[PDB]
Design a protein around this ligand. Structure first.
Ligand SMILES: [Mg+2]
Ligand SMILES: [Mg+2]
Ligand SMILES: [Zn+2]
Ligand SMILES: [Zn+2]
Lengths: 49, 67, 73, 117, 528, 275, 98, 46, 40, 490
């Protein structure tokens, strides 16, 4: 074990990607959210291009 | 989320006519005519019911069989 | 006037002195005689700015340096 | 909220007074009526009833600002017929005319319709 | 460092000693309110109750003030504090029996503002001296500062959510000084350019020209209603311009009541109408497009920006020099009130209808566009043959670029002139342009006729790509559309190239606006 | 007084919801004000006080209180028996100036439940219920006749609250409206030129402009005045149309009478230049 | 912590090798309205000197056609230095040239 | 008197009326919710 | 199925094209730019 | 080119350009080039055929997709360097017209022109009848129009959130919005709007509003603010604790009442709070004894640092959550809900960036009514139109009128052959209105008709985050900066 890497939401390593509309709705995470943003210390943090 | 009782503009109650509209469109495809059979003769009321979005259903969908 | 500590009520000996934060005044419950020397947590005054550019904080005038793990600061 | 209670739009206060009458000084036999806590609804119709009367020289009303429910009516009549009497007659006649409308309406309603209940 | 803390902005001198934050201040959104005088401002009850003014007790006002202490603080027209001559300041919320706190001459009472105290009202950035002026407060419901619409102009306020700052002076000496010097009625004619710094604007400005037209007649009933709003009416209703068949007052006639029976303006008339330089003098149909005021009565001609507006020679300016600021101030409030109410029966609007024209006009315009486009091909054909012959003060490229620009400008101007003519009298769009309310001839040209050649940095669209402006065009195409001419109009939509080229030219306006505010702010500062 | 202009009425059409009529030989100001009264001054009963015990719906608390306010109430019973809350000797509320409503529902089934006016009941005797399914469904079925979906619930969610309906009127809050709307028109041929048409041929003739059927479009008359006003009031369901108009006229009559009694009181003491 | 720090603060580098060259590259996702969130995720930024450099890197260059939204910049300060992709736009993730 | 503390996602009360850890027994979640008061609140329908 | 030989009417009403465009957004994210880079 | 279209070279990641006047060919496979999809046209015809379209419709049960479409090699991704070399055609129409036109050499074709627009410029209807800076102004205001922003907002505790009660999907839509899920989650309301001067309370970028509409719930919204507070050991001899602070023991004595708190130390869901009430009672036990010689009495063992209002006049406590944070400490979030009703001072905008403040509101009685009696919900001043030239504002409106009568949602696609002026006006007359939107309006105060007919009809409007109660402010004495002795920042 070498460190902890922040995960960008609903990318291939964020566990939400493998689930369908009903499953995300069951997890209490909105199906229509776009994702792609990091979550750090309780805040969703998005990078600017 | 959920139809506004009475149309903002005029006053005509418009929750009494909601589910009947959705039912009729599922049965019969003639949305202009469907509004007419429902009785909303006038376009302020027609935008009300016509352009409303039922968001309540996504909310009911959540796991929340708890809150 | 070295006996301050908040017992400076001339008309009658004090029991409690109340801080009306919004008015910036020190008030006494059972008469009426402000005695201002308004401390408004004076600690609040450096933390006043926010809407002006910060993040990097150019207007900072002191690092916390964590003193309660160190004899020297 | 800075906004007023909604009833404040019509409800008279314990200290305020429903009407006040003050005389003009610019021209003879003229008067100015102030009605407090009222709207265009009363003012507009009474102004019209006074104009209908041929002994009224001038009659008019305005509300000075919409956020402070108050109306004023200026009336001027010939120097032999008080503006107070004209104001009284115009109202009483209007009540009578409305009552005739009211009576004639119910009778019209009665006529053959069995769905009036 | 110590030097840095002292330095510039937010430094001890400039950002702090020379300009400190102050106490007794209020700030909120603004909304328009025709019903206020000019030098009035409406103030929210919450803002009026929270802020305070120190009256000193005299023998002859003591009883009223004692009542004010008795109202306490919990209800609006009360008092915050009472200060003893000894130096004691006393709160009026904690003490259980204010009645037991008997007042006497020499105490100061800090009471809530009430209808009639004077404040400095201000909009930053404060560009000139008329941007900060004294006003009378007027307390009313809901939470914005409400200010008469004609005061927008010196301030540059556009109730699109602009803020204002309010400041309340405390002593009688600063109240007298503000009241005498800073007051809005004193601010009417500007020393910068000896003209009236505030004129009639927006609807009142459109509604007045429409009202002064000699086609307008009012029944006895509607004349009474307008007379009812007027403040300084004499009480005598003027002799109707038409006695029979039925009694009628003309628009100009009722307007003659709202001006102070003394102002004597001649000329100021210059609407487009009548003619340019000599037509009315051919025969003297004394006409109706030229305004004449005598003995304080509008004799003939309709009103606009030229008569009624900020122009140095106006009804407002001549009245100010002649009648004096207090009479000009009742004249400003009155003109809006009589004119807003008449508008209230009349109405004013603008639909798509005011922007559409007739079939013949479009065929004529399109035929005008087809001629100009053919001519540009003609210049290009002449240019490629190497027979164009450069103008004596340019290169061959510059002559071509000058020449096509001359033709494409000439084209827009012909079709533009054609639409203004093809329009009728009822077009509300023409009513807004002609009164001088908003917009311009070129605006009319753009919505209905044709938008024309977009620009950047003073020349046609650049070759962003190698010898092209967009990938959609052929290389080295010097025609109109390819170099950024917009052939259609905002009423008929734009094509994709035009939309993108229009977007380039709209941007140049955004960058200029952003930069300009900084350099002017700095150049101004160096001068003072 | 010699100038009172009679004012005749004629009723064209009457249904459960509409009242269509013409008033003639009266003034425009009477016409406009009687219309203003139909919206603002007609009293009615509506929910006005709501207290929520437990609310687990997927909709927040004031949202529910709001929806409850707007439901119409069958005030067929003379709302005059029910006095205004301000005037009544009682502390806060009572049966003599209030009606009481109560709602308790929970979703025990696995399928989604709808909350409607039939579940909301008047503790007060059945004379002042909600508009849905009371005096009858009118052979004209509104499939569910649910009046309004107040909210939706699922397994485990529940809603328990109380509500107090009171008399109030339209110029206070929109809920106290006896009208869904009111049509109003006068002089449909523009004989009086109170509106001025550019290109008069592009305007569609109105339902009452059919008199000359002529495509000539608006014959002028310069000695005319307003005459013959056309109304069409439509009820929201809270009160039968003719009963709204009659209540409006009388209430306005009470209102003017009050101004007379105040005016007489002013001249009860000092004459104040009465003559 | 070194990555967690950079993402949280917005600063650049491990702090020892400066931070001012890539200031504000990281942000708290705005969510005022679904269009707002969706717009911030599609934001594009363009580096400059600070507060007053007027030149060509601020206006609408012709090559933006179809990449960057033609009409959508902040209304002040950075009035052209903050761009947004159009809708069809893409950004190549890169690949081995081998 | 107890303070209920409705659990994360099982919503069985945990009767936390002391200085004990806010972890809900049986259910692994550890975020809470204080529950609506029995105290009544009035809303005008306006 | 397509053959580029028996075809005689290659035209098609470019109001059809939203079906092509939808298949773009329906497949691609609306915000792939972010996601593909982090995956890479 | 043949290999890249054959998938032997990674299409999206490889650009390939030839610059023939310098006789060199550069190829790029690096990251960070912006590229877009385009149709490949060959032999002066489309390479994409109707067979593919029917294959795309087939996907409701077929596995055929966009990636299959690229592999057919009928579309390519073209970056800006390569876009410099192509001969791009605007539409298949022009590509047909070429038999008379100047160019017959096209290589690529636009899949549709409105795609040159980014997300916010895509919510706005008929943008080309807008004078170009208006489109920039809306795209900004569009981020500030509040709406329901995700659907699971009931279990989120965003620091600050704004939700509208009754969003509605835009009566007149742009085709693009079908892919922004904008229909699912709207931003404003379909309002009934009139362009009139009225009693002139709406001069200069403001609006007259229908009070009965704000009352029937129109643009009513809820506002949530979330407060978080942490306990923290934060030192060797400091303790923070949630408790009910008392003047018998604690040191803070702030006159704010502590009575509303629960015994735990923070208030429970449903309680009403105001601009003085304490939401959470935290205290900091600090000196433990470092004041020797009977320094107990009271207000000694611990100081107060609890969190309470200063903020606003506020509303009702929605939710209170006790949990623990990343550090392990006991941590709280408390959400406070308020219901904002549109009032003089709030800011709104239509989709053309016609932003504006509310100048006054009138009850249904006063608003000028039509034949039916449709009283406007908003009156925008006519003068906002001519200098600003958002004609699109009028076109959206006229189109929205036809949609309300037909009952069919319209279509504000910015580039089509729908000759919008003539065609819509013809449809609108057929429904029985004046063909160009005017309606004979009546005056609410006197019943007389308005002499000019008023352009009246529906338009999508937005409520903004800038509510007026948030921005109001004032001072009298108050806090002093003793490092400077002047008043505080704001
Ligand atoms: Mg301005
Ligand atoms: Mg302005
Ligand atoms: Zn209607
Ligand atoms: Zn009672």
């Amino acid at each position: 074990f070498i460190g902890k890497i922040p995960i960008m939401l609903r990318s291939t390593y964020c566990l939400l990607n493998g689930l369908t509309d009903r499953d995300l709705c069951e997890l209490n995470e909105c199906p229509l959210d776009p994702g792609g943003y990091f979550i750090i210390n309780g805040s969703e943090k998005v990078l600017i291009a | 989320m959920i139809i506004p009782v009475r149309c903002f503009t005029c006053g005509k109650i418009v929750g009494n006519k909601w589910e009947a509209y959705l039912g009729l469109l599922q049965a019969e495809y003639t949305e202009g005519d469907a509004l007419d059979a429902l009785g909303l003769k006038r376009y302020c009321c027609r935008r009300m019911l016509l352009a409303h979005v039922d968001l309540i259903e996504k909310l009911l969908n959540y796991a929340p069989l708890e809150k | 006037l070295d006996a301050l500590p908040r017992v400076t009520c001339p008309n009658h000996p004090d029991a409690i002195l109340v801080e009306d934060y919004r008015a910036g005044d020190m008030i006494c419950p059972e008469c009426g005689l402000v005695v201002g020397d308004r401390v408004i947590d004076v600690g609040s005054e450096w933390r006043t700015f926010s809407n002006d550019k910060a993040t990097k904080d150019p207007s900072r005038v002191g690092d916390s340096q964590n003193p309660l793990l160190s004899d020297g600061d | 909220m800075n906004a007023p209670p909604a009833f404040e739009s019509f409800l008279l206060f314990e200290g305020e007074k429903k009407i006040t009458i003050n005389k003009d000084t610019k021209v003879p036999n003229a008067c100015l009526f102030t009605i407090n806590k009222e709207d265009h609804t009363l003012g507009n119709i009474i102004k019209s009833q006074l104009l209908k009367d041929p002994q009224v020289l001038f009659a008019g009303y305005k509300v000075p600002h919409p956020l402070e429910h108050k109306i004023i009516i200026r009336v001027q009549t010939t120097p032999d017929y008080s503006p107070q009497e004209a104001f009284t007659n115009a109202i009483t006649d209007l009540i009578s005319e409305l009552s005739l409308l009211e009576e004639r309406f119910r009778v019209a309603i009665k006529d053959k319709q069995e769905g009036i209940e | 460092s110590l030097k840095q803390r002292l330095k510039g902005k937010e430094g001890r001198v400039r950002g702090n000693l020379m300009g400190k934050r102050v106490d007794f201040s209020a700030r909120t959104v603004i909304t328009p309110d025709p019903n206020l005088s000019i030098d009035q401002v409406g103030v929210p009850r919450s803002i009026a109750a929270n802020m305070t003014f120190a009256e000193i007790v005299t023998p002859f006002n003591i009883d009223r003030l004692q009542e004010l202490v008795r109202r306490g603080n919990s209800q609006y027209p009360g008092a915050k504090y009472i200060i003893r001559d000894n130096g004691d300041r006393i709160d009026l919320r904690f003490h259980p029996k204010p009645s037991d706190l008997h007042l006497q001459t020499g105490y100061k009472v800090e009471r809530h503002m009430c209808d009639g105290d004077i404040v400095i009202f201000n909009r930053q950035p404060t560009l000139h001296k008329m941007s900060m002026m004294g006003h009378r407060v007027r307390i009313l419901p809901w939470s914005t500062f409400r200010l008469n619409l004609s005061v927008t102009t010196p301030y540059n306020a556009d109730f699109d959510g602009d803020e204002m700052n309010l400041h309340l002076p405390q002593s009688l000496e600063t109240r007298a000084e503000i009241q005498e010097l800073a007051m809005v009625p004193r601010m009417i004619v500007t020393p910068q350019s000896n003209r009236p710094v505030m004129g009639i604007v927006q609807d009142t400005l459109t509604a007045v020209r429409k009202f002064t037209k000699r086609d307008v007649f009012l029944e006895r009933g509607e004349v009474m209603n307008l007379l009812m709003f007027l403040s300084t009416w004499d009480g005598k209703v003027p002799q109707p311009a038409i006695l029979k068949p039925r009694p009628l007052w003309t628009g100009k006639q009722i307007f003659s009541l709202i001006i102070p029976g003394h102002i004597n303006c001649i000329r100021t008339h210059s609407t487009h109408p009548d003619d340019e330089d000599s037509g009315p003098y051919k025969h003297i149909s004394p006409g109706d497009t030229k305004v004449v005021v005598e003995n304080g009565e509008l004799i003939m001609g309709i009103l606009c920006k030229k008569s009624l507006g900020t122009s140095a020679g106006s009804l407002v300016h001549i009245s100010y020099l002649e009648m004096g600021h207090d009479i000009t101030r009742l004249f400003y409030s009155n003109i809006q009130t009589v004119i807003n109410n008449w508008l209230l029966i009349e109405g004013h609007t603008i639909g798509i209808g005011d922007s559409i024209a007739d079939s013949k006009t479009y065929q004529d315009i399109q035929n005008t566009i087809k001629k100009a486009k053919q001519d540009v091909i003609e210049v290009i054909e002449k240019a490629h043959n190497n027979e164009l012959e450069p103008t004596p003060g340019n290169t061959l490229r510059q002559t071509f670029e000058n020449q096509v620009n001359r033709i494409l400008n000439d084209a827009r101007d012909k079709t533009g002139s054609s639409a203004q003519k093809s329009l009728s009298e009822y077009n509300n769009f023409k009513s807004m342009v002609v009164s001088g309310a908003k917009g311009s001839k070129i605006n009319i040209s753009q919505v209905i006729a044709v938008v024309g050649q977009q620009n950047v940095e003073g020349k046609r669209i650049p070759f962003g790509f190698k010898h092209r402006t967009l990938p959609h065009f052929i290389k080295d195409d010097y025609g109109p559309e390819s170099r950024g001419f917009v052939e259609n109009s905002y009423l008929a939509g734009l094509t994709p190239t035009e939309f993108f080229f229009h977007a380039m030219g709209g941007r140049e306006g955004l960058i200029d606006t952003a930069v300009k505010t900084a350099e002017t702010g700095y150049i101004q500062r160096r001068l003072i | 007084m010699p100038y009172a202009n009679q004012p005749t009425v004629r009723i064209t059409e009457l249904t459960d919801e509409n009242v269509k009529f013409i008033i003639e030989n009266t003034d425009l100001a009477v016409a406009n004000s009687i219309r203003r009264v139909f919206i603002a001054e007609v009293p009615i009963i509506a929910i006005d006080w709501v207290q929520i015990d437990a609310n687990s719906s997927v909709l927040h608390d004031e949202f529910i209180a709001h929806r409850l306010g707007l439901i119409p109430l069958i005030s067929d019973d003379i709302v005059d028996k029910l006095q205004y809350s301000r005037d009544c000797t009682c502390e806060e509320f009572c049966p003599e100036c209030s009606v009481e409503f109560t709602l308790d529902v929970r979703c025990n089934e696995d399928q989604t439940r709808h909350v409607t006016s039939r579940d909301l009941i008047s503790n007060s005797p059945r004379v002042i219920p909600v508009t849905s399914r009371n005096r009858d469904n009118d052979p004209n079925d509104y499939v569910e006749q649910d009046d309004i979906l107040i909210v939706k619930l699922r397994k485990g969610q529940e809603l328990r609250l109380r509500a107090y309906a009171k008399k109030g009127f339209g110029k206070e809050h929109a809920k106290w409206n006896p009208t869904a709307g009111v049509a109003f028109e006068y002089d449909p041929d523009n004989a009086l030129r109170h509106t001025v048409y550019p290109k008069p041929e592009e305007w569609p003739k109105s339902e009452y402009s059919e008199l000359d059927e002529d495509e000539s479009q608006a014959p002028y008359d310069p000695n005319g005045k307003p005459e013959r006003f056309y109304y069409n009031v439509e009820s929201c369901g809270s009160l039968r149309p003719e009963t709204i108009v009659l209540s409006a006229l009388s209430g306005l009559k009470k209102k003017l009478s009050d101004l007379q009694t105040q005016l007489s009181h002013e001249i009860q003491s000092d004459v104040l230049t009465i003559n | 912590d070194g990555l967690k720090y950079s993402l949280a603060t917005g600063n650049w580098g491990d702090q020892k090798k400066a931070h001012q060259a890539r200031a504000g590259v990281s942000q708290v996702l705005n969510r005022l309205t679904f269009a707002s969130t969706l717009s911030h995720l599609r934001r594009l930024n363009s580096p400059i000197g600070r507060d007053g450099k007027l030149a060509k890197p601020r206006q609408l260059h012709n090559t933006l056609w179809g990449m960057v939204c033609p009409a959508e910049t902040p209304e002040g300060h950075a009035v052209g230095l903050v761009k947004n992709l159009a809708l069809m736009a893409y950004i190549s993730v890169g690949s081995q040239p081998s | 008197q107890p303070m209920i503390y409705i659990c994360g996602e099982c919503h069985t009360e945990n009767e936390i009326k002391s200085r004990d850890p806010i972890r809900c027994r049986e259910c692994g979640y550890r975020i809470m919710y204080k529950k609506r008061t029995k105290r009544l609140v009035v809303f005008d329908a306006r | 199925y397509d053959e580029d030989d028996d075809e005689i009417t290659p035209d098609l009403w470019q109001e059809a094209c939203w079906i092509v465009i939808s298949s773009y957004f329906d497949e691609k994210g609306l915000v792939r730019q972010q996601l593909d880079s982090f995956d890479e | 080119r043949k290999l890249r279209r054959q998938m032997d070279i990674i299409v999206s990641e490889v650009s390939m350009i030839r610059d023939i006047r310098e006789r060199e060919i550069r190829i790029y496979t690096d990251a960070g080039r912006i590229c877009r999809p385009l149709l490949i046209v060959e032999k002066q015809k489309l390479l994409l055929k109707k067979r593919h379209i029917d294959q795309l419709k087939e996907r409701e049960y077929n596995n055929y997709s966009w990636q299959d479409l690229v592999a057919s090699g009928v579309v390519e991704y073209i970056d800006t360097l390569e876009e410099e070399t192509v001969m791009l055609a605007m539409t298949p129409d022009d590509l047909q017209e070429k038999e008379v036109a100047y160019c017959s050499t096209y290589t690529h074709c636009e899949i549709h022109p409105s795609m040159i627009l980014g997300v916010c410029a895509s919510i706005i209807p008929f943008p080309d009848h807008n004078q170009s800076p208006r489109n920039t102004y809306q795209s900004a205001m569009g981020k500030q129009a509040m709406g329901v922003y995700i659907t699971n907002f009931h279990v989120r505790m965003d620091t600050l959130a704004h939700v509208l009660y009754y969003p509605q999907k835009p009566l007149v839509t742009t085709r693009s919005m079908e892919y922004l899920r904008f229909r699912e989650l709207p931003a404003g309301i379909n309002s009934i709007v009139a362009i009139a001067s009225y009693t002139g309370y709406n001069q200069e970028d403001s609006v007259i509003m229908n009070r009965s509409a704000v009352d029937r719930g129109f643009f009513r919204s809820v506002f949530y603010r979330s407060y978080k507070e942490q306990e923290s050991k934060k030192g060797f001899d400091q303790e923070e604790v949630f408790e009910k602070p008392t003047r018998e023991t604690c040191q803070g004595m702030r006159h704010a009442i502590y009575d509303k708190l629960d015994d735990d130390g923070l208030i429970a869901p449903g309680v009403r709070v105001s601009g003085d009430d304490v939401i959470i009672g935290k205290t900091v036990t600090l000196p433990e004894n470092e004041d020797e010689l009977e320094s107990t009495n009271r207000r000694y063992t611990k100081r107060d640092c609890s969190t309470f209002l200063r903020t606003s006049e506020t509303g009702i406590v929605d939710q209170v959550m006790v949990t623990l944070n990343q550090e392990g400490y006991k941590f709280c979030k408390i959400r406070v809900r308020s219901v904002r009703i549109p009032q003089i001072g709030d800011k709104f905008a239509s989709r053309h960036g016609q932003k504006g403040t509310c100048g006054i509101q009138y009850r249904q009685e006063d608003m000028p009514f039509t034949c039916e009696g449709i009283t406007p919900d908003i009156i925008i001043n006519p003068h906002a139109i001519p200098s600003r030239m958002t004609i699109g504002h009028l076109i959206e409106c006229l189109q929205g009128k036809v949609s309300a009568n037909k009952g069919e949602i319209g279509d504000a696609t910015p580039f089509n052959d729908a000759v919008n002026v003539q065609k819509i006006s013809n449809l609108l007359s057929d429904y029985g209105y004046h063909l160009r939107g005017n309606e004979v309006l009546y005056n609410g105060f006197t019943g007389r008709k308005i002499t000019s007919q008023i352009f009246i009809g529906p338009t999508y409007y937005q409520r903004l985050k800038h509510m007026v109660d948030d921005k109001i402010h004032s001072r009298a004495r108050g806090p002093i900066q003793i490092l400077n002795r002047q008043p505080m920042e704001g």
